[PDB]
């Protein structure tokens, strides 16, 4: 139950999470909108990512 | 590149975004027009996803203070207006000390 | 969906579309909805979001864009209402000439 990035995304607020196509994640909170609070498997950094930009492994 | 989900503008989001457009430079000093205010709302909306109902300044004449606490930009006549950065807006809800109706 | 200019012909064709499809007709008004409409058309048609402007109330809100055959009718809870006469009379100007 841990998603992967489909497209690259550069965040522009301190609370979003930036990532490169292929960076793996792990959702900490999807139940709140189409902006999921996720945790980067690569860095360990948490923050909101646009759910429409990711998909399950 | 898909277009990110919708989400409401927020104080913290507004602040980070202001420093961003200030760091980048350009919006500062730029002459105002609805066509620009509108291209703005859309550029932010496309890239960030913030629903386009946050960049509202107050009614003139004079200085146009932003309604969204945290958007550190105002409109100053230099009527012909122009965008001006002023970090005090991040600490004073002037557009509410003046026009409380909107809140 | 290249970005195009909202002309009278485009306004009309659009009003016909949204009338054939149904839904907007009778729908209650809210800024957030008027905004959702502006964006929906902008995404699919490519019309820059500065054409759906009604007139200040109170009362009926006539569209400023000649060719947009929709107006907001109080039933001040408002609701969208198609009236093709608007493509023939620019009432939002006979009435509020300032915007022009």
Swiss-Prot record, chain A:
It is found in: Cytoplasm; Nucleus; Cell membrane; Perikaryon. Non-receptor tyrosine-protein kinase that plays a role in many biological processes including regulation of cell growth and survival, cell adhesion, integrin-mediated signaling, cytoskeletal remodeling, cell motility, immune response and axon guidance. Inactive FYN is phosphorylated on its C-terminal tail within the catalytic domain. Following activation by PKA, the protein subsequently associates with PTK2/FAK1, allowing PTK2/FAK1 phosphorylation, activation and targeting to focal adhesions. Interacts (via its SH3 domain) with PIK3R1 and PRMT8. Interacts with FYB1, PAG1, and SH2D1A. Interacts with CD79A (tyrosine-phosphorylated form); the interaction increases FYN activity. Interacts (via SH2 domain) with CSF1R (tyrosine phosphorylated). Interacts with TOM1L1 (phosphorylated form). Interacts with KDR (tyrosine phosphorylated). Interacts (via SH3 domain) with KLHL2 (via N-terminus). Interacts with SH2D1A and SLAMF1. Interacts with ITCH; the interaction phosphorylates ITCH and negatively regulates its activity. Interacts with FASLG. Interacts with RUNX3. Interacts with KIT. This is Tyrosine-protein kinase Fyn. Belongs to the protein kinase superfamily. Tyr protein kinase family. SRC subfamily. Isoform 1 is highly expressed in the brain. Isoform 2 is expressed in cells of hemopoietic lineages, especially T-lymphocytes. Residues 1-57 form the SH3 domain. Phosphorylated at tyrosine residues, which can be enhanced by NTN1. Palmitoylated.
Swiss-Prot record, chain C:
This is C-terminal core protein. Residues 35-51 are annotated as: Mediates dimerization, Nef-PTE1 interaction. The chain holds residues 74 to 203 of 206 of the full protein. Changing residue 74 to A: Complete loss of binding to HCK SH3 domain and altered viral growth. No effect on Nef-induced CD4 down-modulation. It comes from Human immunodeficiency virus type 1 group M subtype B (isolate BRU/LAI). Transmembrane segments: none annotated. Changing residue 2 to A: Complete loss of binding to HCK SH3 domain and altered viral growth. No effect on Nef-induced CD4 down-regulation. Residues 35-51 are annotated as: Mediates dimerization, Nef-PTE1 interaction, Nef-induced CD4 and MHC-I down-regulation and enhancement of infectivity. The lineage of its organism: Viruses, Riboviria, Pararnavirae, Artverviricota, Revtraviricetes.
């Amino acid at each position: 139950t841990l998603f992967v990035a489909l497209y690259d995304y550069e965040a522009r607020t301190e609370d979003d999470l930036s990532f490169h196509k292929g960076e793996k994640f792990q959702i900490l909170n999807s139940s709140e909108g189409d902006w999921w609070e996720a945790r980067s498997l690569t860095t360990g950094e948490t923050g909101y990512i646009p759910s429409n930009y990711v998909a399950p492994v | 590149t898909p277009q990110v989900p919708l989400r409401p503008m927020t104080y913290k989001a507004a602040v980070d975004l202001s420093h961003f457009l200030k760091e980048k430079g350009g919006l500062e000093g730029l002459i105002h027009s609805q066509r620009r205010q509108d291209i703005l709302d859309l550029w932010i909306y496309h890239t960030q996803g913030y629903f386009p109902d946050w960049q509202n300044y107050t009614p003139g004449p004079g200085v146009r203070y932003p309604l969204t606490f945290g958007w550190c930009y105002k409109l100053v006549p230099v009527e012909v207006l122009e965008w001006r950065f002023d970090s005090r807006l991040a600490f004073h809800h002037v557009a509410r000390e003046l026009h409380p109706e909107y809140f």
